[PDB]
């Protein structure tokens, strides 16, 4: 499957793509404002994620640091990124269908649209100004808006027992972005697409 990753932000981002124990495609790349990077994701990939990283420095070997979404200091990510990270999430070719969503469960750093480029389903978007509106206690001094699990490490925020409810913090993310996951047991906003659909992830879709 093809994923075109487009940076419409006015700032550079370092795109990342992983399934947690491996890179997807090259795993990461710099995208200056306006640039597009097309990756290939193997059919059947379960639990894949794409995200943006901000304010990164990499040396000649591809090792360094980012302020949001750092994946063990690598340009080419093999693992998931450090919160806060807005997440495009997908599982492909699962009994004949693909499943996509956007999640704020690991916080929010960059606005994003995640849409099919082929027929048969609708996209999702989380493009509100979550960083600007972020509750004071969730603001990441490194940049972005942390989720409450990251900040407070409680069973209720992290859904550790599988029994949790919405919270003041999850409701903030849900109010700003109704069509993204705000906590682990949120009413799902997953979209079912045809199996083997192709996609576009656009950072800063509104400008």
Structural domain tally of the chain? 1
CB 182 within 8 A of CB 166: yes
Question: Is 180 strand, coil or helix?
Answer: coil
What experiment produced this structure? Answer: X-ray
Domain containing 201 equals 1-207
CATH, residue 119: 2.60.110.10
Tell me how far apart the alpha carbons of residues 81 and 87 are, in angstroms, rounded to a whole number: 10
CB 125 within 8 A of CB 114: yes
Q: In a 3-state reduction of DSSP, which class is residue 104? A: coil
């Amino acid at each position: 499957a093809t994923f075109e990753i487009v940076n419409r932000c006015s700032y550079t981002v370092w795109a990342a793509a992983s399934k947690g124990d491996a890179a997807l495609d090259a795993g990461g790349r710099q995208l200056n404002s306006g640039e597009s990077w097309t990756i290939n994701v193997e059919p059947g990939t379960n639990g894949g994620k794409i995200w943006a990283r901000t304010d990164c420095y990499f040396d000649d070997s591809g090792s360094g640091i980012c302020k949001t979404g750092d994946c063990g200091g690598l340009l080419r990510c093999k693992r998931f990124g450090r919160p806060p990270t807005t997440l495009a999430e997908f599982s492909l070719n699962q009994y004949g269908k693909d499943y996509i969503d956007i999640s704020n469960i690991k916080g929010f750093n960059v606005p994003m649209n995640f849409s099919p480029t082929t027929r048969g389903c609708r996209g999702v978007r989380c493009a509100a100004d979550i960083v600007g509106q972020c509750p004071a206690k969730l603001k990441a001094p490194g940049g972005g808006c942390n989720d409450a699990c990251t900040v407070f490490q409680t069973s209720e925020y992290c859904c550790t027992t599988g029994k949790c409810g919405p919270t003041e913090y999850s409701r903030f993310f849900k109010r700003l972005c109704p069509d993204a996951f705000s906590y682990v047991l949120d009413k799902p906003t997953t979209v079912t697409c045809p199996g083997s659909s192709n996609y576009r992830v656009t950072f800063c879709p509104t400008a």
